[PDB]
Design an enzyme around this catalytic site. Sequence first.
Site, PDB file in Angstrom:
ATOM      1  CE  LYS A  38       9.644   8.395   6.351  1.00  0.00           C
ATOM      2  NZ  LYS A  38       8.322   7.865   6.819  1.00  0.00           N
ATOM      3  CG  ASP A  65       7.029   4.992   3.587  1.00  0.00           C
ATOM      4  OD1 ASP A  65       7.013   4.751   2.357  1.00  0.00           O
ATOM      5  OD2 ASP A  65       6.399   5.955   4.066  1.00  0.00           O
ATOM      6  CD  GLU A 124       2.978   3.136   4.280  1.00  0.00           C
ATOM      7  OE1 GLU A 124       2.110   3.235   5.168  1.00  0.00           O
ATOM      8  OE2 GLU A 124       3.499   4.144   3.743  1.00  0.00           O
ATOM      9  CG  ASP A 136       0.970   5.376   2.050  1.00  0.00           C
ATOM     10  OD1 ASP A 136      -0.116   5.833   2.441  1.00  0.00           O
ATOM     11  OD2 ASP A 136       2.060   5.841   2.461  1.00  0.00           O
ATOM     12  CE  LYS A 186       1.024   8.086   5.334  1.00  0.00           C
ATOM     13  NZ  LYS A 186       1.996   7.136   4.676  1.00  0.00           N
TER      14      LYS A 186
END
Lengths: 363, 363, 363, 363, 363
Positions: free
Chosen positions: B159, B187, B212, B235, B259
């Site tokens: 992250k 991400d 991402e 995303d 997702k």
Amino acid sequence: LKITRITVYQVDLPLEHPYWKFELLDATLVKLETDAGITGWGEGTPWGHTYVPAHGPGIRAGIETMAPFVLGLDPRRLLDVERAMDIALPGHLYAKSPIDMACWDIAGQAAGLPIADLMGGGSRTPRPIASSVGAKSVEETRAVIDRYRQRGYVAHSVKIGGDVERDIARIRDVEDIREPGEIVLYDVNRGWTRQQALRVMRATEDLHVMFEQPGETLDDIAAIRPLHSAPVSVDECLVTLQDAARVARDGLAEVFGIKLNRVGGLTRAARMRDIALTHGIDMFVMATGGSVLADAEALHLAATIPDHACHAVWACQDMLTVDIAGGRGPRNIDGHLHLPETPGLGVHPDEDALGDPVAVYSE
Amino acid sequence: LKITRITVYQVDLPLEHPYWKFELLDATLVKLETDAGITGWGEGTPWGHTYVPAHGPGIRAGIETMAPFVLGLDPRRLLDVERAMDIALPGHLYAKSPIDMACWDIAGQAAGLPIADLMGGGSRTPRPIASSVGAKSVEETRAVIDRYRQRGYVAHSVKIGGDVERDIARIRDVEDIREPGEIVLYDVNRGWTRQQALRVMRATEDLHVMFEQPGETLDDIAAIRPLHSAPVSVDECLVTLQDAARVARDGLAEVFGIKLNRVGGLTRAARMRDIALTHGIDMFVMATGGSVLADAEALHLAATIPDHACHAVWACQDMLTVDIAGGRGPRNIDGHLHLPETPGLGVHPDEDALGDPVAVYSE
Amino acid sequence: LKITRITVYQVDLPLEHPYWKFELLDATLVKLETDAGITGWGEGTPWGHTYVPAHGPGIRAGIETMAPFVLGLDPRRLLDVERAMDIALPGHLYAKSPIDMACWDIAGQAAGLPIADLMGGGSRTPRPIASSVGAKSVEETRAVIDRYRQRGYVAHSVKIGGDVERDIARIRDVEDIREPGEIVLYDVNRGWTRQQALRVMRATEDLHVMFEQPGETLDDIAAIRPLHSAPVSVDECLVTLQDAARVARDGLAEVFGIKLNRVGGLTRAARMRDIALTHGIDMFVMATGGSVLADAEALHLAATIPDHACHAVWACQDMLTVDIAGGRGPRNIDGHLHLPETPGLGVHPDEDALGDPVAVYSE
Amino acid sequence: LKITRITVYQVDLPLEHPYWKFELLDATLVKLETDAGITGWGEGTPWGHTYVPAHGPGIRAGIETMAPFVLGLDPRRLLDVERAMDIALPGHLYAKSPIDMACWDIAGQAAGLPIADLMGGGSRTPRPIASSVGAKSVEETRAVIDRYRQRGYVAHSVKIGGDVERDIARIRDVEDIREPGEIVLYDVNRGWTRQQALRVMRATEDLHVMFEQPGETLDDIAAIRPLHSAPVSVDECLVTLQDAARVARDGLAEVFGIKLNRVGGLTRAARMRDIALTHGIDMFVMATGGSVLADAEALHLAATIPDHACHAVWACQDMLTVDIAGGRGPRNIDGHLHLPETPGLGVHPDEDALGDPVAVYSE
Amino acid sequence: LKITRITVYQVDLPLEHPYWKFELLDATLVKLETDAGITGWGEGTPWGHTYVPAHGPGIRAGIETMAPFVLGLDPRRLLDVERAMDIALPGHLYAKSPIDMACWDIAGQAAGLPIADLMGGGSRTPRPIASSVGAKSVEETRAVIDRYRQRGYVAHSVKIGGDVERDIARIRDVEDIREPGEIVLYDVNRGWTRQQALRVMRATEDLHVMFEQPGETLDDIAAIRPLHSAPVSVDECLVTLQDAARVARDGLAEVFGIKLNRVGGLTRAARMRDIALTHGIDMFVMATGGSVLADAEALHLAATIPDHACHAVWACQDMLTVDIAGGRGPRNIDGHLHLPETPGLGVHPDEDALGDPVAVYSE
């Protein structure tokens, strides 16, 4: 509530450090009066008459034509003030800014709220101040930054333009001495041709630097947009809301360099903020020029931006040799401006330093 | 065959490692019953109520409104279930996902086929699991990766966001210790402005890395698309099939980060797969959050993708301190999920761990 | 000043004329309380749960999650309220609208100003009301218009969709009896395929008519944009400010059909106004549904638009069989709504008609 | 040769037929003097201060700032004069026009050539004059045209805007009485929203009519461009050469409505001509407003256009109740202006009618 | 479960009404066998070998190459069958269709579900049948329609092409006798040049008519797209999913004319449906040609489309003089096809009418 009298002032604010023949700012102050006896001030101070389509005489001129239609209105009704000014005299936003400033200020106090709060609520996070770094050898350069850095300054605007070889060298020099977390913007002031812009902006991508106004016009900014990867901040050509929405929908630049007098003041900078924030665009907010009444206005706006999205403000008062509020208003407290807690603009001048009214308009 | 009763459950799944105030997932489980006595389950578990437009109460809410129109239908007719939910309540895909999950599961068993197979046939290749790496110093960073790498993990999601200087440093650090054949995705979670995105994505092209959601919205992703060369995975803003087809026709990103809860579940993730595969786009498939019933659903989808085109899945169960199936379902067998061979979802919970029904809808 | 308690109410407002099974509006009312004891109200009333992604339970749901983060704040700081709601729960604008309504109302009174005036200043020109005309034979059609026209109504919204041959016939019939200066909008409510839209919109260009939402999505509106010449008003798919700025930069439609609950209430409809007005786009402003507290909110917005640029408002109260303010608030005075002169929203309900609180959130 | 003194005058030119409160033009005259004693004149006369971003006080203002940099130069070197004015004060083209007019005039005489000839050679074909037709009933309308048509006028500019139903009616009425070979332009003056423009421009395609400025901004003109087939003439928003080249490359309009004061005078209208002529675009050339010195300037430009490509000019002198040249200069000789044969502008005023100098700038 | 043997058949289906030298369809039937002894059938029948890139020998050819890789697989795993065929032999979708048909049929029965239901659930609304109207004088034309209309037919496909004057005349004639609620499509079959298309499609906009394949290629369809307003249905050039998504994102046509053999059968027509439905595009679904096994396949697909979005199907069996199922399968029951209730395709032929196997492939 209603506007009863507009009074116009003219003040020469001399510079602490003159340059090359630039020496003083022709500054226009406006003071509107209401039948409730609630008074507000506005200031219009182009940085000269060469930098942008705005000049001292031209604002003072604007008001003359615009005055009769602004008298009488309710100062707390900024869409009505605005629509009256617009009908009265299209364009000329640098002339409409000080009136809008004043009007907000009245409504601010009348609501018992500081500008930033009345405009929707403002942040108390101390805001960094952009320094100013004029042309100078790589040697005299470092000098102004370290000196400035001792005086608490933590954000610098290094001026470039003219020469690709020399400009690349200047960026590489400044990026060589720049302590982590130091904000520097390279301000071109349109001093580059497409071909030059493209060249230096590409040359220095591996330093991850940002540029302001790398071209004469938004079209030059756009033409070369797909050709390089440096984040560009869009300044002198950021005038209307159409320029505003057009940059952001068409991904022409990544940063708005708002300047209040230029864009027409508070109400219409607000809308550029609304846009920038929904399209992921970051701001620098500074008055075009002027005394602390100018810094105050830019601060009320910089406040209405969340702090991650507002890189730096400017204090033009530290650039001036005169002081027209004897200490009052948001001043450079350790490299940062702190939003005033006082209703309205939260700083009025004393009419001691303004000289006699240069014109008056009543009913 | 027909749907006879929807029963709704609510479960707090606490986290093994809490953070900064995030501590537990509000999770909604659904259980549909049929007159044949074939039962199916669905789960809806946003990772909080801040990450994306979805929240616990909002799904539980959705079903209330949506329930009467879903009762009665044939569970094995997913275009009819879907069109009834859509008519009943437009949008709200995070609320429609668990019902769709359950419905598939019933049809799965009724056809005597595991989800992945009934959806067209699924791969048995063990699928890698994306780890999770929260903010931490370059030192504490390496720690979580090597530790995670000993525990068999071979794909990591690091992250980043917030700070260009620090983020560049983090990518360069992680790419310094990354053993060949190691899958890492960086991400951003929308934690970047256009100007920031452009900056760090360019800065690290020579490490050949993937990002991402580098921006708030697909429009920020698009604006900067032509400006850099890093492959971007799309995303949180990958919601409908229009976002789906629009990315791919207009070459706005190269990777779909599906997702399931977000996009509305199995039937409508299927169509994003259909698109990505005909336009040469690669997927990461993970449930938004939840227990093993969430990992199971994402696995049935990751299975229907050929293995070169599916980089990694996720096991949110290893992130949780509670277990609602006493070991049952696809679990982390050495850094990888193995598609279950059992008809339907191939894992039901025991209603021991779910608490009393929070609401029930029958005929 | 600060927010002390949010209290949530639920009311069934039955319809004067039910239809085909639509019979009553599930309506959510919110009441925020401040430590100064200045109280404000907001209402959220989707026209059903089928017309648009919004539903009664879903707002009441939204507030539950959103409440803890809105308590405590200064109600007069709408960018802070907004940023707290957004962080707290992305999207879900139909849930954020009533809170924003209430908050404005408090700030309105605290500034001693009617909403419309505090938002920048509002017009006193009586605003026309859009009637409502459901499906019916060419014969029963004329009936509702002439009857409605006797009751003083001077603006009509004729509903169409489903059938190209029948729809063309309906427009040609209504345009055959339409006395000069009569405002009629043909509202499709997405009830047309691209192919159908294109067909009927072309077929009736020689009657110079306007259409609302001729397609499921803004993309259908866009695809066929270059194919015909009828002015299209963009409604259900006009949700965010990106949809806002994208329509107008790319000339995808000519008219904004604002609906307050849909777009997230006052502060964020304001920005769509700012855009529409700088890009030469005209508005219809109506609450999505509800009592007079809904009409009041839409009026404060319709007021902030210059009258040439605001075609008609709506009074949903005349559509309802119950009255929750015993006469108070802007009512249909001869086909027109007159902006209230009272500080804030300028109409509170009496809690007599609201029933017991369905939930309460304090500190 | 060099410029020795700029002298500025101010004159109220009253209108023969006042309207609704418009009654007289604030007009600025400039007179430059050279050491050779060759004198030239320029005039700047916005049609009011509401029609376009230009006003009397603002030009008189412009010169003050701009004067010191224009003194000293060689008047016959218009790219040097221009670059000095531009550097001195960006934008403000309505202020730069009269100086440029004067400067040409000097160079004209010094070369012993009428403006039109020195600019490359001008046509002697008598040029038609655009009449002016204010709002009025279909009855009072025909009146002004037939009366005007008896007075020899063969080209009319009918004003419309505000109302689609009424505007369509007005065009259809005027096109009903329009004798073959009669030039009529329908001038909207931005008095239409996108939605209105689109509507009436489509409604009247079967009359093959032309429209001027059907929208607030070139962007409104552009958005609706692909939506209808009526030739549009681009007027108030035709300001810079970028607007110039952008219209023509991107096929946004078919006709340039040049107005000299607006675009910055002769040298820079010349370049719009160069563009229009290579991209197959037709012109109307008129001074913005003023006396015969204004008509003279517009004629020298209309002359440099081949006659098929120049539809009509305007004589604002016939609109005025005062005469500042006692008969001298190009006048309405039977509905047409005849290019003067005299060196330079070919008409100077007598300083009898100009009043005392309002300001003077020497060396 | 697994595929054990593919057996290939060849049948001449003669036409009831031959034409000009077209006389009979070369038809390929496939029969796959499974170790469970569950058998499925597929048919591939191009309408000739001139209409589209597909021919009898070429499918029979395709299978030879493709066979070894399809044997062995699980028939109920259509993404695995598909990926094996694609790897085995790229393109050639007209050859892959009958295998895919058969495979579905097996999985259908194995799940005990009719194709339409297993594919997500199908509608029981009787589906209209498109008639066929060959070239003929305006007189012989009306004849075929009224005769056809007596035989219960309520949807007609009138063939045009070749001649603009004659084609306009034909459309105007047919639209002169067309009773309300009558579905007619004008099928061009690529028989128009751009210039011709543009001409006739414009000429007949005031009849609101629809056209199929007005051009050789989707690029001709696209080039002229912005030039006219008639809804175009995209047929022979609608081949892959890229053509699919490209039409719809870029608004190139409004209607998909699916033909199962052409697009590669059920699984991949499904995805075009998914797209058309999210982008507001309407379908006609017909087998390319063949017996009732062809009509059955197209019906299972037409069923999975909501009835407002599916204009008409086709029964090619009524066009044939032979019958290979002695009455079995969906037949023309009063101008309409009724979806069969039987598991799988719901119609097998009797191998009595198919002749000896033309080739066999086992393990």
